[PDB]
Amino acid sequence: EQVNELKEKGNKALSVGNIDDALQCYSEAIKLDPHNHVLYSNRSAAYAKKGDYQKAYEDGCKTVDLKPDWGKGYSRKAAALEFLNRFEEAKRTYEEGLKHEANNPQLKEGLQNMEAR
């Protein structure tokens, strides 16, 4: 519950635009629960909003490492790759995610976007 508490605190900070506070909350939760993919996925989002795409990417990778069946982790990873202008890798990441969650609409959209560039 303490982990959920910190995650919620982070989500709230992010909602009021306090991204650094959100990162601190997610990072504290991660220290307590280092295998929680949701925390890395949320922190990846916060880093992407902040504009630190390398860290958004690292957290997206960790999300996929922890929970390979979860499509959203690949979206985190792939979005970071797009920001990093690594589109070939972004496309392969959407494809990799689809090997786990074939009907995921966000991954399908991402793949479509990369195939249309």
């Binding site: 949701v38 916060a46 979005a79």
Partner: peptide, 8 residues
């Protein structure tokens, strides 16, 4: 630009 999905 890429979409940043909502947090969970």
């Amino acid at each position: 630009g890429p979409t940043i999905e909502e947090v969970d």
